[PDB]
Ligand SMILES: [Cl-]
């Protein structure tokens with residue numbers, strides 16, 4: 444499976460078009476109370492996240508619950524549907540915009556993609572030793588509201604780097620994005636506080652993330668990193684002070700240490 448690693452991910456920022464494909468939340472449920480009072484779940488709209496780490500481009504394919512109607516083994520179906528939708532997107536693009544590499548968030552996507560991309564034999568499909576939680580996008584109201592409200596499947600295009608590439612590298616933007624996503628992933632409440640340093644902190648309507656000065660981003664990034672390491676340390680009973688620089692890099696990236 445896992446070719447992408449914390450020691451070769453510099454590759455991500457070169458000339459080949461690369462997509463991460465996350466199928467984690469294609470078939471999706473929410474917790475709800477039955478009015479009768481009891482706790483249980485109900486299926487809600489899902490999404491495929493398809494992400495280019497150099498450009499910041501996000502293809503968001505909303506999956507309406509109607510696809511599940513009358514089907515068994517929804518976990519399996521979700522994987523096969525994701526592969527079908529990724530293949531469809533590739534075919535819809537001119538050859539010069541088609542990816543050369545697909546990196547799957549989950550190994551379960553390896554085989555379905557191989558089968559659907561049988562007519563694109565030179566596309567490399569690989570797993571990742573990292574664990575980049577694109578699912579944390581669901582905790583961003585913009586995305587959470589859009590997916591939940593959908594009445595039909597649809598593709599919506601976004602960019603997860605906002606205007607950052609005007610002043611910082613893809614690597615630096617990726618590193619910022621991963622800090623944001625992993626922080627949201629592990630502690631939604633604390634991350635959103637960190638991402639709102641001033642009462643005047645706002646996000647532009649055409650953006651995903653707050654408008655912050657260069658200096659404000661530095662502080663945010665320190666605080667997010669601090670949150671991720673403390674959370675990890677608590678979960679794994681490891682003292683943060685004991686961590687090496689390399690271990691810290693691995694933790695942020697979601698890699699096993
Ligand atoms: Cl760059």
Ligand code: NA
Nearest residue numbers: 571572573574
């Ligand atoms: Na992984």
Ligand code: NA
Nearest residue numbers: 610655656657
């Ligand atoms: Na700026």
